């Protein structure tokens, strides 16, 4: 349990159930209390995020090459927010907001996180990926973070072994019902939950 | 007793044996009491699929000599009684008009005490002014008995009284084209009688009784059983006048020989004089079995009663004998339940009943059944015969000889007879008689007129609106009854086809109805029948359209998610006409795109360029909003037509402002950018991407809200007519007209009054009027607001600004920055 106190927690369109910057700050301390750290976000719809808090991250088949498959977070909540919707329409063509999520790990993790300035999901970059984490592709106890294209923001790959091993919490960060497909608006983003965003320092060079 | 389908037809044959009509009574004076004492006597049971009660089937059986009582064209000793159901509260004006116009007789029920109430006598006002034929019955006797003790001559002044305040009513707002049509107890015209122990009585039945007793025929008796007539019981002789030759008081006929008798029988069984009873009920033959013979008191009193002057039977003889049939009446009704030429062809043919003219049916109101959510349609054949399979053109309220506007020409499925809660199939139905209809719910709302001629005008149409103006929120308090609630709201939406049940986008379980009581009923109907489990309801919120008055201040841009689609549209207003047209079915969402391109360019200045354009109506696919397809050699447009239009559907039902519906909004696609592969450019891209960029545009095009206006009819006496005006004058209300009717001081006032003004109306217009102002309202037209929206302090910003908080939305309205391309 990593929810901290209150009320039975839930995802919907009206917003994160039971789930305030109060409740939020508790929970993001009682993680740190036992070694674990925060590592960025994850935006996706609204069951998935039930998936991911309740019955924890697990791998799946996605669409992409097999050496870059793993679990995809960004350290900036806005490029992550992007994802926090549904995918598909139903039959009626309803398009609803997803949720934000905080993605941990364990502390005991982190020498497995590297950082590089090439341009992610790449051939052009899996060479010095492969280099980084002293292994040959896919990622597995250890984590990549870079521009998720060129000139773009940056987001951070963890393997699938790694992302098994995280504990995810919500984000005290809403989507917007009203505005779906609308940027993230910074103004929207509770100063105290900016205040234990800040990310790890990751290594530029191998181990 | 139970009839087959061929005595039905028999019966319904002799319309001059027929009696159209309903019972006017308040609540609390035994309404269905009375009601109950007529379907259990002369009830009519036949010999799968249920409906909802609205009318029931009489029969009475007379004699030879009876029915030459009759002073209209009779045939025969049968007859048959449409009791057709009525409203239990005045409130409902709509409905008790619909009853009244399809009825011809009233049985007006009357408090012994407490005389004529206000809403009876209201009610009766309306129902003369429907050309329609009373007959009284005085209610509630015991009470004046058992209670207050009264003495002959005082029972007998208070029903005096009463008569004399019915007559009141009536010769003041009886129309002189019926003559003479006042309710006199000498000539069998009113009854009296206890509802709650099932007696009642006329003065002729007491004459038939006396008739021989005293060698008279009983028209001459029954004269003297009312008014200053006086039987010496010394002399044995009859005088007019009201003392002896020494001066002693005299008894009138009626305390002596009605009222007598039946004093003495309450006084001996209330009493428990076990002597007198068994005495006094031989000496009028009143015969007790078994288990009766040992009841004592009120149980007594209520048997005895019960057979010495059965109700039903006094009711009855009054209806069949003074209430005019189908025939009579129409004769003089039928001017006035035409809108159009009195001498016309159908107009003549209703005048004379006649089976063999061009069919002219009536829909009063649609019937919720069992044959799953479908509605039998309920009404009257004022000319022409009905018939299965028959092909007849349904017209509804807008319709005009001329044009083919709410014109449905179809074929009845089955013509049923409506006994009640249950349905028998027919093969035809004459001219006099009332029916149901299936097969026509789908053409008419609630109210049409049938006919087979192709130049008859609709009968006198009651205006009805299904445009929900008024709604609410509905949750279970408890969450384990929700699947009781969701099955309860879709069982709502069926008993009732002005009703909506619908989800919004938030999910919430909203009810939406036509005013506020109807909406006031539908949840009580619910929470204790359709659901019936308790149910937490916000507090009545007013239904708003949100709109724009001018073309967008720049091109609304915006990027799909994945940033490889874009969507340039421009939003501007619909002309008023175009709304309405579409509201009304000329332009038409299912019409041939060609076709309606025509109409729109021809009779509404469109450019037939862009009318062939149309993507798609909005919200549920019909709406007073239209997106056009303005792009030029755009790859691949056509593979995201269903999300555009999809996307709209949700654009339009909750706009950008406060979540209201849209109205009157065209939005001109531009131009649209589309990646070269349909795997990035779904559904989950373009919706997002064409909801935001209509957001943008209609917020470019100086947005506004506009308000339901309600049109109001009030019926008044011209003494209280100064309080409608006083009521209107702080509820922002537009008087439209006033007329009077012509002879009577009942004045008709119309005017319009914004919906969100009308919360209370009919209860401050009630003491406004002392009761006497009948309301009627019903939904007119949309309103746009001048102030500006976005101003939080002005009126229409402080209506959005209250709805936003209340959605749990942010309080100030998002710029079209907010749905615009970020950049
Ligand atoms: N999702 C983000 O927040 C994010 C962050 C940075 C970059 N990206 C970019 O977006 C692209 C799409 O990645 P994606 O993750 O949105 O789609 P994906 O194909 O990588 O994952 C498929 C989906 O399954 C869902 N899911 C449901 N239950 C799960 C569970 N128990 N464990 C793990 N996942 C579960 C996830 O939410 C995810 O949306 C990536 O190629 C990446 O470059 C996304």
Known sequence: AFLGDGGDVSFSTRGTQNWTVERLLQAHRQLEERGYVFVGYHGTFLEAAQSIVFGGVRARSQDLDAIWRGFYIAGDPALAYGYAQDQEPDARGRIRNGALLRVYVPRSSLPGFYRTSLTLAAPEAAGEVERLIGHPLPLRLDAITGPHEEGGRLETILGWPLAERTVVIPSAIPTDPRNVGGDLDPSSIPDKEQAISALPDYASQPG | ????????????????????????????????????????????????????????????????????????????????????????????????????????????????????????????????????????????????????????????????????????????????????????????????????????????????????????????????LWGDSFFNPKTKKWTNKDTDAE?????????????????????????????????????????????????????????????????????????????????????????????????????????????????????????????????????????????????????????????????????????????????????????????????????????????????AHNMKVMKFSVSPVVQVAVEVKNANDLPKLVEGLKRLSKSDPCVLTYMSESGEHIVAGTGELHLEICLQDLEHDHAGVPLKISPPVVAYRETVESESSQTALSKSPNKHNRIYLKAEPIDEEVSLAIENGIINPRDDFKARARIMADDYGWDVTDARKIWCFGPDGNGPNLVIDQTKAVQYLHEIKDSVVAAFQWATKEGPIFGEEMRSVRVNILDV????????????????????????????????????????????????????????????????????????????????????????????????????????????????????????????????????????????????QEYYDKL
């Not at chain 2, 009536?170 to 206890?194: C, I, K, M, N, W």
């Not at chain 2, 209330?270 to 078994?290: A, Q």
């Not at chain 2, 109700?311 to 009054?318: N, R, T, V, Y």
């Not at chain 2, 070269?676 to 935001?692: K, S, V, Y």
């Open chain 2, 247 to 455: 001066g002693k008081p005299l008894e009138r006929a009626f305390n002596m020989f009605i009222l007598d008798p039946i004093f003495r029988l309450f006084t001996a069984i209330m009493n428990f004089k076990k002597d007198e009873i068994p005495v006094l009920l031989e000496k009028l033959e009143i015969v007790l079995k078994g288990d009766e013979k040992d009841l004592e008191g009120k149980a007594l009193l209520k048997v005895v009663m019960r057979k010495f002057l059965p109700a039903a039977d006094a009711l009855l003889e009054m209806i069949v004998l003074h209430l005019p049939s189908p025939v009579t009446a129409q004769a003089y009704r039928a001017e006035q339940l035409y809108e159009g030429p009195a001498d016309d062809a159908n107009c003549i043919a209703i005048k004379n009943c006649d089976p063999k003219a061009d069919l002219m049916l009536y829909v009063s109101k649609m019937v919720p059944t069992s044959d799953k959510g479908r509605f039998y349609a309920f009404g009257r054949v004022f000319a022409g015969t009905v018939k299965s399979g028959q092909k007849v053109r349904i017209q509804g309220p807008n319709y005009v000889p001329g044009k083919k506007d709410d014109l449905f020409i179809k074929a009845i499925q089955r013509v049923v007879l409506m006994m009640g809660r249950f349905v028998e199939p027919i093969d035809d139905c004459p001219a006099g008689n009332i029916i149901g209809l299936v097969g026509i719910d789908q053409f008419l709302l609630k109210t049409g007129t049938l006919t087979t001629s192709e130049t």
């Open chain 2, 673 to 816: 950018t589309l990646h070269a592969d349909a795997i990035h450019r779904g559904g989950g891209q373009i919706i997002p991407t064409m909801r935001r960029a209509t957001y943008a545009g209609f917020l470019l095009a100086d947005p506004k809200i506009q308000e339901p206006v309600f049109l109001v009819e009030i019926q008044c006496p011209e003494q209280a007519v100064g309080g409608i005006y006083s009521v209107l004058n702080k509820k922002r209300g537009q008087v439209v007209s006033e007329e009077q009717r012509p002879g009577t001081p009942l004045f008709t006032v119309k005017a319009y009054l914004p919906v969100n003004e009308s919360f209370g109306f009919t209860g401050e217009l009630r003491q406004a009027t002392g009761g006497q102002a009948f309301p009627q309202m019903v939904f007119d037209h949309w309103s746009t607001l001048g102030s500006d929206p976005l101003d939080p302090t002005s009126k229409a910003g402080e209506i959005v600004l209250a709805a936003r908080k209340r959605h749990g939305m942010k309080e100030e309205v998002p710029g079209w």
């Open chain 2, 1 to 224: 007793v139970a009839f087959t389908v061929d005595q039905m037809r028999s019966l319904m044959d002799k319309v001059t044996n027929v009696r159209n009509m309903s019972v006017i009574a308040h609540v609390d004076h035994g309404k269905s009491t009375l009601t109950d004492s007529l379907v259990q006597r002369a009830g009519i049971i036949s010999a799968g699929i249920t409906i909802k009660s609205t009318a029931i089937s009489l029969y009475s059986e007379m004699s030879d000599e009876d029915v030459k009582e009759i002073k209209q064209k009779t045939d025969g000793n049968s007859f048959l009684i449409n009791l057709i159901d009525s409203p239990g509260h005045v409130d409902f004006s709509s409905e008790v008009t619909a009853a009244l116009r399809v009825t011809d007789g009233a049985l007006v029920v009357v408090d012994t005490i407490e005389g004529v109430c206000v809403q009876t006598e209201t009610v009766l006002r309306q129902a003369l002014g429907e050309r329609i034929k009373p007959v009284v019955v005085i209610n509630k006797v015991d009470r004046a008995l058992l209670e207050l003790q009264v003495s002959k001559e005082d029972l007998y002044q208070t029903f005096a009284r009463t008569v004399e305040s019915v007559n009141v009513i009536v010769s003041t707002y009886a129309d002189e084209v019926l003559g003479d049509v006042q309710v006199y107890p000498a000539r069998g015209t009113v009854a009296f009688g206890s509802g709650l122990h099932g007696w009642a009585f006329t003065i002729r039945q007491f004459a038939t009784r006396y008739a021989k007793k005293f060698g008279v025929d009983k028209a001459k008796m029954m004269d003297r």
